[PDB]
Design an enzyme around this catalytic site. Structure first.
Site, short mmCIF file in Angstrom:
data_model
loop_
_atom_site.label_atom_id
_atom_site.label_comp_id
_atom_site.label_asym_id
_atom_site.label_seq_id
_atom_site.Cartn_x
_atom_site.Cartn_y
_atom_site.Cartn_z
N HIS A 139 4.38 1.55 -0.67
CA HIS A 139 5.45 1.63 -1.65
C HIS A 139 5.28 1.08 -3.07
O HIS A 139 6.24 1.08 -3.84
CB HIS A 139 6.69 1.00 -1.02
CG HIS A 139 7.01 1.54 0.34
ND1 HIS A 139 7.39 2.85 0.54
CD2 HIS A 139 6.97 0.97 1.56
CE1 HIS A 139 7.57 3.06 1.83
NE2 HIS A 139 7.33 1.94 2.47
N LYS B 82 19.92 0.29 7.27
CA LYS B 82 20.34 1.52 7.95
C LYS B 82 20.43 1.29 9.46
O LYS B 82 21.30 1.85 10.12
CB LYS B 82 19.34 2.64 7.67
CG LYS B 82 19.30 3.09 6.21
CD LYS B 82 20.46 4.00 5.87
CE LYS B 82 20.34 5.35 6.58
NZ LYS B 82 21.47 6.27 6.25
N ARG C 116 0.81 -1.21 0.00
CA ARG C 116 0.00 0.00 0.00
C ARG C 116 0.85 1.27 0.00
O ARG C 116 0.56 2.22 -0.72
CB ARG C 116 -0.93 0.00 1.21
CG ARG C 116 -1.72 1.29 1.39
CD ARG C 116 -2.70 1.17 2.55
NE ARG C 116 -2.04 0.94 3.83
CZ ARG C 116 -1.50 1.89 4.58
NH1 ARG C 116 -1.54 3.16 4.19
NH2 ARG C 116 -0.93 1.58 5.74
N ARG D 199 7.83 13.90 -0.60
CA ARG D 199 8.22 14.56 0.64
C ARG D 199 7.44 15.84 0.88
O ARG D 199 7.20 16.63 -0.04
CB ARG D 199 9.71 14.88 0.63
CG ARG D 199 10.60 13.66 0.57
CD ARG D 199 12.01 14.00 1.04
NE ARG D 199 12.81 12.79 1.20
CZ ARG D 199 13.64 12.57 2.21
NH1 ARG D 199 13.77 13.48 3.16
NH2 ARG D 199 14.33 11.44 2.27
N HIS E 82 9.68 -3.44 4.43
CA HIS E 82 10.16 -2.09 4.73
C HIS E 82 10.99 -1.54 3.58
O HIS E 82 11.76 -2.28 2.96
CB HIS E 82 11.00 -2.11 6.01
CG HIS E 82 11.62 -0.79 6.35
ND1 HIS E 82 10.88 0.31 6.72
CD2 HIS E 82 12.92 -0.40 6.40
CE1 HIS E 82 11.70 1.32 6.97
NE2 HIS E 82 12.94 0.92 6.79
N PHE E 83 10.82 -0.26 3.27
CA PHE E 83 11.61 0.37 2.23
C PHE E 83 12.71 1.11 2.98
O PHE E 83 12.44 2.08 3.69
CB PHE E 83 10.77 1.36 1.41
CG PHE E 83 11.47 1.86 0.18
CD1 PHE E 83 12.34 2.96 0.24
CD2 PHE E 83 11.31 1.21 -1.04
CE1 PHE E 83 13.02 3.39 -0.89
CE2 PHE E 83 11.99 1.64 -2.18
CZ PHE E 83 12.85 2.73 -2.10
N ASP E 84 13.94 0.63 2.84
CA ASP E 84 15.05 1.23 3.56
C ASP E 84 15.61 2.48 2.89
O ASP E 84 15.80 3.51 3.54
CB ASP E 84 16.16 0.20 3.75
CG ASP E 84 17.10 0.56 4.89
OD1 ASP E 84 16.60 0.76 6.02
OD2 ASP E 84 18.32 0.65 4.66
N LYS F 156 2.23 11.87 6.25
CA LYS F 156 3.43 11.05 6.34
C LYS F 156 4.50 11.97 5.74
O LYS F 156 4.36 12.42 4.60
CB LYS F 156 3.27 9.78 5.50
CG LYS F 156 4.36 8.74 5.73
CD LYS F 156 4.01 7.44 5.01
CE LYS F 156 4.98 6.31 5.36
NZ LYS F 156 6.33 6.50 4.77
N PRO F 157 5.57 12.27 6.49
CA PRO F 157 6.65 13.14 6.04
C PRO F 157 7.35 12.75 4.73
O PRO F 157 7.49 13.56 3.82
CB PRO F 157 7.62 13.13 7.22
CG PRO F 157 6.72 12.94 8.39
CD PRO F 157 5.76 11.88 7.90
N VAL F 158 7.78 11.50 4.67
CA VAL F 158 8.49 10.99 3.50
C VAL F 158 7.99 9.60 3.12
O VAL F 158 7.69 8.78 3.99
CB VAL F 158 10.00 10.89 3.79
CG1 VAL F 158 10.74 10.29 2.60
CG2 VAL F 158 10.55 12.27 4.13
#
Length: 124
Positions: free
Chosen positions: A12, A66, A10, A85, A119-121, A41-43
């Protein structure tokens, strides 16, 4: 409760386009994927490749995340992505996003069975 794999899709995934469509793409995408419901959502990065191609990354280059975890993978090829962003004039409930389209390698954290992205790193 949304599964981790489903949340990644949803947030990414946007295959129905080869690349960000307009400077307004992010405003539209962030709202539709419900990433501005109770807060902006900031980014958020969105990948413009088939779900299969993104899921395949979990079997590609194993790289550190990370946060130090070792379940991250970097795509062998570059992929079309759009980074969304918040801008300076962004203020809930009136979220505003800058749309930046690019073609680079994506790095995602994977987990579960099937072993899929959760997760998108980052992107390179």
């Amino acid at each position: 409760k949304e599964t981790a794999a489903a949340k990644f899709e949803r947030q990414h995934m946007d295959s129905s386009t080869s690349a960000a469509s307009s400077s307004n793409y992010c405003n539209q995408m962030m709202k539709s994927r419900n990433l501005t419901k109770d807060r902006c959502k900031p980014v958020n990065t969105v990948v413009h490749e088939s779900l299969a191609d993104v899921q395949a990354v979990c079997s590609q280059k194993n790289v550190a995340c990370k946060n130090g975890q070792t379940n991250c993978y970097q795509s062998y090829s570059t992929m079309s992505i759009t980074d969304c962003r918040e801008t300076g004039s962004s203020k809930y409930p009136n979220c505003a996003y800058k749309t930046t389209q690019a073609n680079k390698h994506i790095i995602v954290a994977c987990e579960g069975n099937p072993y899929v992205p959760v997760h998108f790193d980052a992107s390179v």
